[PDB]
Amino acid sequence: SRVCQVTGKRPVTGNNRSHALNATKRRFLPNLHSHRFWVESEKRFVTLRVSAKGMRVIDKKGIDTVLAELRARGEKY
Amino acid sequence: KLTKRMRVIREKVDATKQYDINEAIALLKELATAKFVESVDVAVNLGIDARKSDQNVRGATVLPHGTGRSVRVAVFTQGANAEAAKAAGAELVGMEDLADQIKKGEMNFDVVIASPDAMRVVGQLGQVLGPRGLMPNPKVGTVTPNVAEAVKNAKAGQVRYRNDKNGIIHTTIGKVDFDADKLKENLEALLVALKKAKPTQAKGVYIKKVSISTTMGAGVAVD
Amino acid sequence: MQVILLDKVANLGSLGDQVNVKAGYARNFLVPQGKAVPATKKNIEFFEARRAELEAKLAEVLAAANARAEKINALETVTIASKAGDEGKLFGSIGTRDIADAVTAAGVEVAKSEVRLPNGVLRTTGEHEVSFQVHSEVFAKVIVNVVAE
RNA sequence: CCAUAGGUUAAUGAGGCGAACCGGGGGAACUGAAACAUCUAAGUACCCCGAGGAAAAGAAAUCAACCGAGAUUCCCCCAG
RNA sequence: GAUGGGGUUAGCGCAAGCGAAGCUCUUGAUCGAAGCCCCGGUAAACGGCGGCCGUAACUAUAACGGUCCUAAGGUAGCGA
RNA sequence: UGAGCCUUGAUGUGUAGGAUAGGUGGGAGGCUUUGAAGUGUGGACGCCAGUCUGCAUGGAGCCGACCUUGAAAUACCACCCUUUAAUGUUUGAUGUUCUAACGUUGACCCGUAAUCCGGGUUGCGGACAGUGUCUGGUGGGUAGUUUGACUGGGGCGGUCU
RNA sequence: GCUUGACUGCGAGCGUGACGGCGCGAGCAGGUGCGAAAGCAGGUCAUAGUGAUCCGGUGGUUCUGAAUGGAAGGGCCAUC
RNA sequence: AGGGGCGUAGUUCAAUUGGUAGAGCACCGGUUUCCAAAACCGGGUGUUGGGAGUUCGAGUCUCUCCGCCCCUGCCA
Ligand SMILES: [Mg+2]
Ligand SMILES: [Mg+2]
Ligand SMILES: [Mg+2]
Ligand SMILES: [Mg+2]
Ligand SMILES: [Mg+2]
Ligand SMILES: [Mg+2]
Ligand SMILES: [Mg+2]
């Protein structure tokens, strides 16, 4: 499903407004993108489904550090 | 193309950048390079444009330092105001005779002042005095019952100004030989009068730029 | 995206020059091709350490250069023996082989290529002034006394 | 090419059921407004996930007001 | 986010008041595509095919028109 | 190739006239082998009337200055205004040359007894496409509703203060 | 002819309305105008010329100001 | 509301962009031919919506007094 593998962002629901404030249910989905991240330690490319906000934290945190937290959650690669 | 005289003028002033009043007045004193004594020529640009009718400004200002610009005063008035004008030093005082002298071409005066009763006679001179801008107008204080004061107030250094179509102010604070400090006071007194004259609707910086120049001198910006 | 250069990528500079650059450049091109590495605190210090360590290597080599230099510069004149030229030209020449055996014994060890014999191949017998170039900037000096055998 | 993916064993664990209570993910309309859109109904009904005998919450980046109080939960007031 | 207006106050002032810097409230210059306006095309695209006036040897009628509305006012064929 | 300003050059005919006489002061000056006037095409533009000055030539002349004329002059200056031209400064708009993101429902290899999937190799495309947030337009495609009362039944007509 | 009473604060007592409300009013206070004064003037001979509340805008106002000083906002007055 | 726009002879529509409002067709005349009609002229048709400025002087620029417009826009 539409879940970020780094930040865990998932679709959320809200209202479409209008000039008359009429509220209709809607969904907000993350800006998810499938990217192949280069992991130096394994000298390999690993593909992750990440949001655009997740991409920013990867540079700040390091490719190895983020993957270590994901392994704590536990998943396939 | 440019001669040596003109190239040294632009070498002394680098107008591409702004200058402060203290520096600007120093530059003006060094720009006085002519055979005859020069007069400061004001070059102040107003953000407001006279293209709107109601935004026109007409004003007057008496300067204690003075300008030196000829101030021969012709006065149209009768009775006690004629004696008061003569006692105040008016060179020419009369009514119909002086108007007829003007019609005959005797124009040995620099400033006309009229009493409101004399406006009937001065009105006939509108074809002559109008194009030259010498026509008395109440908005500049040259139409007043206190004729003696108008003759006084003038004489020394009373200066006039009228906005053009391009919304620019070209006055004269005084002669170039005037001291820098006095010249700074002269322009400062002028400047406050302009602020009072400013209207309200004008949604623009009242002054678009302030510059000073002499006869052959370059324009130095004032801040 | 601060990243420390590993080479002379385009106009970015040369090896070892941290520069601010758009994320994408390094996030997918510089790093996966190995042309650079993120200049993150840890990495930059290590590279700066690499800078100063090679400087110390440069220091050490030039330091040991002056060592050899002085060792042999100050006097340290050598004596060699060959078949007397009978008051004039000492018959045969002395070349790369024997000028290097002289220094070997007497101390400092120099390569035949290093040896710089300026005045031809030193054929005449007498005082001769021979220099050595142990290092590119080191200008060593030696006096050689030729004697008959 | 190492590797990695993958593959074969061996150990553990989980699977389902069950009333309500609980937390979380979704989430109406009838109705009321004497109509009806904001609003109300209502985060109710319902669906889904998970847990326990309780759950949840919880040890101040909280309130107070120049005096002070000192986690959370629950009850009566404050107060329609 | 150009510019302008406010709030606050370091400070200056007997105080009236003024007001640095910072923060903050607002005004909205400049940039800005499609669309719309605009210019054409398209009716085996959806659709539309009227009135007025004059004019043939008795009349009549109006081809031959003219005129207005309109975009243009029904051809072949058929027709109580 | 855009739109800006910055500076510089050039541009200013209702007419009278000096006539290719913006706008407004300053201004009696002006002005200058440093090229006086000149003289020769540097002139290009333009009203073809005129204008500025490749540069060479000659060496002090040059010019506020009537009249009408708004009117007194690219004789005098700040420097600006219009017509603008070049020049300096900034965002973008397409086009292209890329690959490295991304795409491949191209080929090949492997997982593998596999027209799935994944990985690898390669080709092609490529900073597009595509997707997210925000946003303009469109949208009976799909919803939720409204669509009054009086009234010799109702509708129609009329009426509502 | 001269003028702004087309006044400000009020108002005994009445009228007419289910009410919201509408209408009439001597007199009082402060300031006016016209008259020499008595006096008259709180619009127009009278009865039609009109629209509640909410919300927002403008001016004024020592009323309020969520720790305190301000301010925002609100209130009151005038008014759209 | 806000930003662009337009109102010249009975018939419409050009312009000038401060100096200077024509053409169109209708009408009456005149030409033209042996004569008609067609054509070609003369000419009679104007306050440039309107009002006031600016101005030596503006139907022109400005302010606008409006009608008629196109775009766009707001919860008494
Ligand atoms: Mg030999
Ligand atoms: Mg209801
Ligand atoms: Mg239990
Ligand atoms: Mg029948
Ligand atoms: Mg319903
Ligand atoms: Mg009914
Ligand atoms: Mg009356």
User: DSSP secondary structure string, B169-185?
Assistant: E-----BTTS-HHHHHH
**CA B158 to CA B193: how far, in whole Å?**
13
Could you tell me whether strands A24-28 and C140-148 are parallel, antiparallel, or unpaired per DSSP bridges? unpaired
**CA B33 to CA B104: how far, in whole Å?**
39
| B8 class by beta-carbon count within 10 Å (0-12 exposed, 13-18 middle, 19+ buried) | exposed
Mutate to test the interface with C, among A42, A59, A63 (most CBs of C within 10 A): A59
Output DSSP code: residue B118.
Answer: G
Name the amino acid, one letter, at B163.
N
Strand D closer than 7 Å to the CB of A29? no
Query: What positions of strand F are covered by protein, i.e. any atom < 7 Å from a CB?
Result: 6-8, 22-35, 52-54, 70-71, 76-81, 100-103, 118-120, 127, 130-134
Phi-psi bin for B67: left (phi > 0), alpha (psi -120 to 50), beta?
A: alpha
**CA C39 to CA A16: how far, in whole Å?**
44
Q: Do C23 and A59 touch (CB under 8 A)?
A: yes
* Encoded tokens for C149: 């055998």
**Vertex B206: Cα angle to B204 and B208 (nearest 5):** 85
Q: Give the distance, in angstroms, between residue A23 CA and nucleotide G55 C1'.
A: 22
Classify C17 as helix, strand or coil: coil
Both ends of chain C: CA-CA distance in Å? 75
> Please, which residues have CB within 8 angstroms of residue C40's CB and are 6 or more apart in sequence?
A62, C2
Output DSSP code: residue C10.
Answer: T
Phi-psi bin for C124: left (phi > 0), alpha (psi -120 to 50), beta?
A: beta
**CA B191 to CA B196: how far, in whole Å?**
9
Closest CA to A35 of C25, C31, C28: C28
Please, what sign has the CA dihedral across residues B63, B69, B72, B75? Answer: negative
Would you say A57 and A4 are in contact if contact means Cβ atoms under 8 Å apart? no
A45 touches chain C (CB under 8 A): yes
Output DSSP code: residue C131.
Answer: E
Q: Give the distance, in angstroms, between residue B126 CA and nucleotide F68 C1'.
A: 19
Q: C87 alpha carbon to ligand 6 midpoint, in Å?
A: 153
Chains near B, with 3+ CB pairs < 8 A?
A: none
Output DSSP code: residue B217.
Answer: P
Q: A22 alpha carbon to ligand 2 midpoint, in Å?
A: 17
Which nt is closest to the CA of B162, judged by C1'? F24
Distances (CA, A) of C67 to B14, C55, C64, C103, C124: 63, 18, 5, 15, 32
* Encoded tokens for B14: 């680098």
Would you say B67 and B173 are in contact if contact means Cβ atoms under 8 Å apart? yes
Name the amino acid, one letter, at C102.
A
**CA A55 to CA A32: how far, in whole Å?**
10
Output DSSP code: residue C89.
Answer: B
Q: C129 alpha carbon to ligand 4 midpoint, in Å?
A: 150
Would you say C35 and C7 are in contact if contact means Cβ atoms under 8 Å apart? yes
Count chain A–chain C contacts defined by CB atoms under 8 A. Answer: 12
* Encoded tokens for A70: 């994901």
Closest CA to B157 of B64, B43, B220: B64
**CA B164 to CA B46: how far, in whole Å?**
10
Both ends of chain A: CA-CA distance in Å? 16
Resolution reached, in Å?
4.5
**CA A39 to CA A53: how far, in whole Å?**
19
**CA B214 to CA C2: how far, in whole Å?**
57
> Please, which residues have CB within 8 angstroms of residue C64's CB and are 6 or more apart in sequence?
none
Name the amino acid, one letter, at C31.
V
Would you say A49 and A32 are in contact if contact means Cβ atoms under 8 Å apart? yes
Name the amino acid, one letter, at A53.
K
Query: What positions of strand H are covered by protein, i.e. any atom < 7 Å from a CB?
Result: 53-54, 56, 61-63, 74-75
Q: Can you tell me which residue has the tokens 């390091």? A: A62
| Helix or strand holding residue C25 (H, E) | helix C23-25
Give the CATH superfamily of C69-148.
Ribosomal protein L9, C-terminal domain (3.10.430.100)
CA dihedral B97, B98, B99, B104 (to 10 degrees): 90
For D26, nearest residue by CA–C1' is: A13
Classify B59 as helix, strand or coil: strand
B147-155 helix and B80-87 helix, angle to the nearest 10 degrees: 20
Report C:11-50 residues touching A (Cβ under 8 A).
23, 27-28, 31-32, 38, 40
| Helix or strand holding residue B161 (H, E) | strand B158-162
Strand H closer than 7 Å to the CB of B130? yes
**CA B193 to CA C59: how far, in whole Å?**
76
Residues 33-52 of chain B within 7 A of strand H, judged by CB, are: 51-52
- Tell me the sheet residues that pair with B162: B58
**CA C82 to CA C125: how far, in whole Å?**
9
| Experimental approach taken | cryo-EM
Nearest C-alpha in A relative to C43:
A62
Closest CA to B109 of B92, B85, B97: B92
Q: Can you tell me which residue has the tokens 């005045």? A: C119
**CA A69 to CA A73: how far, in whole Å?**
7
**CA C97 to CA C77: how far, in whole Å?**
18
Q: Give the distance, in angstroms, between residue C14 CA and nucleotide E65 C1'.
A: 94
Classify A8 as helix, strand or coil: coil
CA dihedral B114, B118, B124, B127 (to 10 degrees): 10
Q: B120 alpha carbon to ligand 4 midpoint, in Å?
A: 102
Write down the H helix ranges in chain B.
Answer: 4-12, 21-31, 80-87, 96-103, 119-124, 126-129, 147-155, 180-197
